[PDB]
Amino acid sequence: ASLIYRQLLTNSYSVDLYDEIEQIGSGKTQNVTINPGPFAQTRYAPVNWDHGEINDS
Amino acid sequence: IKENSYVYVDYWDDSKAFRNIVYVRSLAANLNSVRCTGGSYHFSLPVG
């Protein structure tokens, strides 16, 4: 019964087929690789509030 | 219209630069000053 190990080693190539099968079976996702470089947050502006355009006559 | 008065001109365009004016941090510009002159008007008067 020693030939079990010999047979498994010799026939091990079929695991490539098994890998292809499980690859086809598995669902897939992916990445949108993130950007670095938010090193400078930006404020709005120097903003001053005032009454609008008065309509004089 | 006098020194007291202002005059407004609304303007717009379908170019990229103007279409991108939705949010603004600062908008500066310099213009050429121009002269506005007034023509003549006959007051249509049914006598005199």
Automatic annotation (TrEMBL), chain A:
Annotated gene: VP4
Compartments (UniProt record): Virion
Domain of life from the UniProt record: Viruses
Residues shown, of full length: 2 to 58 of 775
Protein name: Outer capsid protein VP8*
Species whose genome carries this gene: Rotavirus A
